[PDB]
């Protein structure tokens, strides 16, 4: 389809509990409304749903590899390095986040906080408890369980048995003020789902996938060298607004879901102490996004099973298609139904 979200605005969704029970079905719905055209969409769950009953058992959890984020650069163009530090607990990380050195500054509004982020990026290197293999969900949670979404990304584990952490498994993100994730797309241009468990907000910048190539030309212009897959390049919105790169901004609060879409470039930072949970997933539409992307997943099993008419032409390298970033995804295909019956 097309012309659903022609402005490519970041859309916010508030489903009822009945719309919330099927995860894959609701992803097809928000794409039928055009959420995928912004590269990022917010999902506000109903109040009856709570992923964990209490967050007081978490002080003794281990953060195996925290990273000190050292950012260099000037004039809205930066490069961040991630130096690994010693292990610590969440209680220690919380006391370090609210330390005077790392605490959230005084700010009038977000515009003030955004200004102080890009002004004080170089001066202090914050600690980010990122990429922790684990989950904070309860076991009985059956709706939107990040540890088990039951999408077609399970074909990797169900057929080839490969398990990739942060992609097949959930990751945990304990943050503090100024902790940043750089401009990037998900591995193999996969989807991603991020849920903010508790704490201070997490802000997102997102570029629509139909303009992602304009950011890639911009970054190549600054460094003469898919190097943005190093995921350590920071670009200020001042620079994007100067060269005409379309982008939108939204703030994710505690208890809200964020979906990133294939070839949706995103970047952002944490306002203060928070905990986020994230994993990757896929719909039927992603298969063509993963094919054009060639952590390296082999797309062979997806094409051999769900695109079998194109398989031999893809092995011969004669399947040259152009992605239509506006087409919504399908919910089911005859090849997918007969595959679930085989398993």
Ligand X SMILES: CN(c1ccccc1)c1ccc2c(c1)CCC[C@H]2CNc1cnccc1C(=O)O
List the catalytic residues: 166, 173, 184, 186, 266, 278
Rule CB under 6 A: say whether 283 interacts with ligand X.
no
Q: Does 293 bind ligand X (CB under 6 A)?
A: no
Backbone angles phi, psi at 187, to 5 degrees: -55, 130
Least distance (Å) between residue 227 CB and ligand X? 11
User: Does 128 participate in binding ligand X (rule CB under 6 A)?
Assistant: yes
Nearer to ligand X, 181 or 281 (CB): 181
Determine which residue in the list 173, 191, 195, 289 makes contact with ligand X, applying CB under 6 A.
173
Scanning 14-22, 30-38, 86-94, 225-233 for contacts with ligand X by CB under 6 A, the matching segment is: 225-233
Report the residue from 90, 130, 215, 234 that binds ligand X according to the rule CB under 6 A: 130
- What is the CA angle 240-36-265, rounded to 5? 35
Binding of residue 117 to ligand X (CB under 6 A): no
Detail the DSSP E strand segments found in the chain.
12-13, 40-43, 62-63, 67-74, 77-84, 88-89, 127-133, 171-175, 180-184, 191-199, 202-207, 233-235, 248-252, 257-260, 265-270, 274-281
Position with the least CB separation from ligand X: 181
158 binds ligand X (CB under 6 A): no
CB of 130 to ligand X, least distance (A): 4
Backbone phi, psi, residue 101, to 5°:
-70, -35
Residue 194 marked in a binding site: yes
> 211 to each of 30, 170, 216, 264, how far by Cα in Å?
20, 29, 9, 9
In terms of CB distance, is 181 or 286 closer to ligand X? 181
Contacts of 67 (CB under 8 A, 6+ apart): 82, 83, 84, 85, 127, 128, 130
Per CB under 6 A, the segment of 24-32, 118-126, 142-150, 226-234 that binds ligand X is: 226-234
Would you count residue 194 as binding ligand X (CB under 6 A)? yes
Which residues 15-44 are close enough to bind ligand X by CB under 6 A?
A: none
Distance between CA atoms of 246 and 263, rounded to whole angstroms?
Answer: 14
318 is in an annotated binding site: no
**Residue from 85, 116, 231, 304 in contact with ligand X (CB under 6 A):** 231
Alpha-carbon torsion angle 280, 285, 288, 290, nearest 10: 0
**Residue 177 interacts with ligand X (CB under 6 A)?**
no
Alpha carbon distance 81, 288 (integer Å): 32
Regarding 234 and contact with ligand X (CB under 6 A), the answer is no
Residue 232 found at the interface with ligand X (CB under 6 A): yes
Of the residues 63, 193, 276, 284, which one makes contact with ligand X according to CB under 6 A = 276
Residue 181 interacting with ligand X (CB under 6 A): yes
Q: In the window 33-92, what residues touch ligand X (CB under 6 A)?
A: 82
**Spatial separation of the C-alpha atoms in residues 273 and 92, rounded to whole Å:** 12
Distance, in Å, from the CA atom of 36 to the CA atom of 3, rounded to the nearest integer, reads 12
Q: How far apart are CA 152 and CA 286, in angstroms?
A: 10
Q: Which residues of this chain interact with ligand X, rule CB under 6 A?
A: 82, 128, 130, 173, 181, 194, 230-232, 266, 276
Residues in binding site for Zn(2+): 230
């Amino acid at each position: 389809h097309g012309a659903q979200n022609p402005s490519c605005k970041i859309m916010t969704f508030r489903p009822t509990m009945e719309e919330f029970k099927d995860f894959n079905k609701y992803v097809a719905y928000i794409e039928s409304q055009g959420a995928h055209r912004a590269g990022l969409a917010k999902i506000i769950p109903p109040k009856e749903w709570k992923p964990r009953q209490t967050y007081d058992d978490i002080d003794d959890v281990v953060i195996p590899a925290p990273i000190q984020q050292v950012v260099t650069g000037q004039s809205g163009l930066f490069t961040q390095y991630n130096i690994q530090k010693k292990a610590m607990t969440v209680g220690e990380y919380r006391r370090l986040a609210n330390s005077e050195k790392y605490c959230t500054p005084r700010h009038q509004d977000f515009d003030d906080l955004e200004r102080k982020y890009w002004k004080n990026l170089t001066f202090v290197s914050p600690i980010y408890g990122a990429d922790i293999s684990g989950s904070l969900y309860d076991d009985d949670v059956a709706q939107w369980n990040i540890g088990s979404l039951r999408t077609i990304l399970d074909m990797v584990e169900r057929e080839c048995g490969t398990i990739i952490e942060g992609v097949n498994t959930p990751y945990l993100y304990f943050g503090m003020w100024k902790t940043t994730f750089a401009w990037h797309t998900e591995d193999m241009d996969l989807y991603s789902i991020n849920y903010l468990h508790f704490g201070e907000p997490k802000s997102w910048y997102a570029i629509p996938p139909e303009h992602g190539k304009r950011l890639e030309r911009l970054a190549i212009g600054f460094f003469p060298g898919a190097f943005l897959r190093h995921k350590m390049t920071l670009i200020s919105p001042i620079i994007l607004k100067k060269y005409g790169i379309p982008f939108s901004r939204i703030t994710q609060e505690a208890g809200e879901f964020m979906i990133t879409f294939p070839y949706g470039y995103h970047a952002g930072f944490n306002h203060g102490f928070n905990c986020a949970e994230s994993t990757n997933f896929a719909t039927l539409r992603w298969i063509d996004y993963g094919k054009v992307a060639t952590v390296k997943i082999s797309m062979d099993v997806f094409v051999r099973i769900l695109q079998p008419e194109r398989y031999e032409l893809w092995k011969q390298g004669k399947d040259l298609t152009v992605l239509d970033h506006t087409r919504p995804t399908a919910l089911t295909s005859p090849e997918l139904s007969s595959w679930s019956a085989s398993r």
